[PDB]
Design an enzyme around this catalytic site. Structure first.
Site, mmCIF file in Angstrom:
data_model
loop_
_atom_site.group_PDB
_atom_site.id
_atom_site.type_symbol
_atom_site.label_atom_id
_atom_site.label_comp_id
_atom_site.label_asym_id
_atom_site.label_seq_id
_atom_site.Cartn_x
_atom_site.Cartn_y
_atom_site.Cartn_z
ATOM 1 N N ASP A 1 -6.196 6.490 -5.190
ATOM 2 C CA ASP A 1 -5.763 5.083 -5.317
ATOM 3 C C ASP A 1 -5.813 4.559 -6.914
ATOM 4 O OD1 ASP A 1 -8.718 3.103 -4.105
ATOM 5 O OD2 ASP A 1 -8.295 4.230 -5.830
ATOM 6 N N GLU B 1 0.855 -1.171 0.079
ATOM 7 C CA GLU B 1 0.037 0.203 0.184
ATOM 8 C C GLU B 1 0.808 1.084 -0.108
ATOM 9 O OE1 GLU B 1 -3.693 -1.890 -0.102
ATOM 10 O OE2 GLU B 1 -2.940 0.199 -0.406
#
Ligand code: CL
Ligand code: CL
Length: 164
Positions: free
Chosen positions: A20, A11
């Site tokens: 994202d 991440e």
């Protein structure tokens, strides 16, 4: 290697609001804020999550707090899910992390949808499960990460995360 290190690698860590891979507002260690296209909605969600006026930015400590909450949530979500619990319970400690990784990324609902893959994992048919997992939008959209997770399920080792 443990779940936190694993997800920290997949991440990354950003202290400012970012989009994202799917274009959704997120912050910290993959902490999704909202699916809404409004940056203001995202800022409001952030403030609410942290408990202060952030104006779009947080501290490392705050990112870590969200992260702990997020991992606990994923684990708890798995344990509450009738399709997931049995699989998770059947896996060794390393492979459990791979399952947690998927849930953190796509939600329990999404993961519970890999019906065929889940049965193969339950049956410990690693190579077969690996191929089935690859036939997914997930793999095609985030191939490098899916490859890491899939290798982990196949081997029961951390090799895919070693040297990263
Ligand atoms: Cl496919
Ligand atoms: Cl990727």
């Amino acid at each position: 290697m443990n779940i936190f290190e694993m997800l920290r690698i997949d991440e990354g860590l950003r202290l400012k609001i970012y989009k994202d891979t799917e274009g959704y507002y997120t912050i910290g260690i993959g902490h999704l804020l909202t699916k809404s296209p409004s940056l203001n909605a995202a800022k409001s969600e952030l403030d609410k999550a942290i408990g202060r006026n952030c104006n779009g930015v947080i501290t490392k400590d705050e990112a870590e707090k969200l992260f702990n909450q997020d991992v606990d949530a994923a684990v708890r979500g798995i344990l509450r899910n009738a399709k997931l619990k049995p699989v998770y319970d059947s896996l060794d400690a390393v492979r459990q992390c791979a399952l947690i990784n998927m849930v953190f990324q796509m939600g329990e609902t999404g993961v519970a949808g890999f019906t065929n893959s889940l049965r193969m994992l339950q049956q410990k048919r690693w190579d077969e499960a690996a191929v089935n997992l690859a036939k997914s939008r997930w793999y095609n959209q985030t191939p490098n990460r899916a490859k890491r997770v899939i290798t982990t399920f196949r081997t029961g080792t951390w090799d895919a995360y070693k040297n990263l």
